[PDB]
Amino acid sequence: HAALRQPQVAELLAEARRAFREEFGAEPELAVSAPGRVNLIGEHTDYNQGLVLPMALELMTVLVGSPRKDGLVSLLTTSEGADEPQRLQFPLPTAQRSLEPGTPRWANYVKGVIQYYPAAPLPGFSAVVVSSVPLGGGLSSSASLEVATYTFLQQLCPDSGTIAARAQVCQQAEHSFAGMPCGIMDQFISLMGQKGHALLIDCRSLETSLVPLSDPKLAVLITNSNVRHSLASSEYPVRRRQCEEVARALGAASLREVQLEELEAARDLVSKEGFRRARHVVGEIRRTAQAAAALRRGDYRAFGRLMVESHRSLRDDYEVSCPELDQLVEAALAVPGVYGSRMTGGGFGGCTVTLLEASAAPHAMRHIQEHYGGTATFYLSQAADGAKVLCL
Ligand SMILES: O=C1CCCC2=C1C1(CCCCC1)N=C(Nc1nc3ccccc3o1)N2
Numbered sequence: 001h002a003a004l005r006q007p008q009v010a011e012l013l014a015e016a017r018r019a020f021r022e023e024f025g026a027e028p029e030l031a032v033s034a035p036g037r038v039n040l041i042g043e044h045t046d047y048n049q050g051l052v053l054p055m056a057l058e059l060m061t062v063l064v065g066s067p068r069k070d071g072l073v074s075l076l077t078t079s080e081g082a083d084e085p086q087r088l089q090f091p092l093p094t095a096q097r098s099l100e101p102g103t104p105r106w107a108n109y110v111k112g113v114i115q116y117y118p119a120a121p122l123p124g125f126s127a128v129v130v131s132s133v134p135l136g137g138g139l140s141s142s143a144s145l146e147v148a149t150y151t152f153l154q155q156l157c158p159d160s161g162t163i164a165a166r167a168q169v170c171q172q173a174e175h176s177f178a179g180m181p182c183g184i185m186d187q188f189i190s191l192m193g194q195k196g197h198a199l200l201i202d203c204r205s206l207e208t209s210l211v212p213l214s215d216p217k218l219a220v221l222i223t224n225s226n227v228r229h230s231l232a233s234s235e236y237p238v239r240r241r242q243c244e245e246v247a248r249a250l251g252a253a254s255l256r257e258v259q260l261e262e263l264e265a266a267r268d269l270v271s272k273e274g275f276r277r278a279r280h281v282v283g284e285i286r287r288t289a290q291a292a293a294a295l296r297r298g299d300y301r302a303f304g305r306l307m308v309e310s311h312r313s314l315r316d317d318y319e320v321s322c323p324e325l326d327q328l329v330e331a332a333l334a335v336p337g338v339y340g341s342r343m344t345g346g347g348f349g350g351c352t353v354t355l356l357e358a359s360a361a362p363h364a365m366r367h368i369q370e371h372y373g374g375t376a377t378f379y380l381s382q383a384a385d386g387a388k389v390l391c392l
């Protein structure tokens with residue numbers, strides 16, 4: 001019932017630096033950091049060209065390294081949650097032959113970003129990877145590694161592209177090398193986050209707004225279920241297809257073009273579950289605009305309430321909650337000074353996010369732990385920076 005230590009850039013850097021020296025026998029030339037994410041509201045909207053309101057966490061992936069002249073990639077990772085081996089080497093992909101996904105799984109993230117990095121000539125490199133983002137804990141560890149990877153290749157061989165194009169590369173890596181067809185959000189927030197700000201992302205226009213998210217009377221409590229049902233992986237692409245079918249059945253480019261009136265009128269042209277999936281998306285996009293508005297004018301109570309409506313939508317219409325998250329939500333909402341709680345991320349496990357009076361975070365943690373049928377993990381994050389570079 002205490003908030004886990006969040007090591008700062010400087011300490012994770014020192015750790016990666018010590019590790020790099022031991023493994024390669026020379027100080028690294030470069031250092032990058034990219035954070036994980038919590039989504040405040042706007043779940044399953046991103047691949048629906050909707051609105052998302054994520055913020056970057058203090059939890060991050062650091063990567064320290066050095067260019068090589070031999071064209072090969074040598075990786076070590078210190079994240080002992082990672083799958084064996086901790087070390088991998090492979091040559092740069094060529095016109096002739098490409099990197100392929102395999103073992104160990106953690107390296108597929110680096111391989112994917114390197115495969116789709118759009119700027120030549122990319123040299124080989126030696127790199128240590130360290131992370132505070134809990135691996136597959138539903139705060140976008142993978143996106144943090146993809147974006148850190150991207151940030152590092154930029155030092156090797158500058159791109160000339162947009163922030164969104166870089167996110168799209170990281171997302172391609174997730175799709176093709178991790179086999180998780182994610183939307184743009186996790187990569188976008190990891191690139192674009194700013195200390196003290198949530199990032200409203202229009203996943204249609206790709207417009208973004210840094211929204212002041214700084215009142216030291218309020219806190220954001222992340223609770224890890226420490227659970228991940230197999231459906232988190234298998235049912236994610238099912239939701240995407242269901243959403244896509246409902247949009248085909250309505251002549252819509254996306255569910256962003258569809259309001260509840262239109263959707264109710266066409267009840268006959270879609271499945272019982274189709275209609276339910278779409279009802280959530282439509283309502284979640286509305287609720288994200290509403291939450292954005294509420295945040296600007298300082299209406300924490302309206303914001304918390306919209307969080308509770310997003311969770312109910314996710315649990316009943318989208319059906320991507322699970323008993324553990326349901327339990328952590330009802331627990332959190334029973335604590336004086338809690339304005340709202342919801343599952344965040346893909347669903348079927350992972351974390352909940354809770355907005356509450358800062359002075360209440362301690363009591364919230366005691367009560368959620370006591371009421372949780374398993375063992376919950378706690379972080380208290382303010383909004384944090386996106387991808388950063390330190391020359392060494
Ligand atoms: O199996 C899954 C299924 C879906 C979620 C996904 C996990 C694994 C796969 C590889 C190892 C264990 C968990 N890891 C990623 N993220 C990740 N971020 C990292 C940062 C530094 C080092 C390693 C990292 O692995 N999340």
Ligand SMILES: COc1ccc(Cl)cc1C(=O)NCC(C)C
Binds near residue numbers: 214355
């Ligand atoms: C998610 O955060 C908010 C949601 C709504 C409103 Cl009106 C204010 C905040 C805020 O200023 N939190 C302070 C910091 C802990 C993010």
Ligand SMILES: OC[C@H]1O[C@@H](O)[C@H](O)[C@@H](O)[C@H]1O
Binds near residue numbers: 047183185345347
């Ligand atoms: O809001 C649901 C979200 O699920 C995340 O886990 C995925 O990485 C995002 O792209 C978004 O679809």
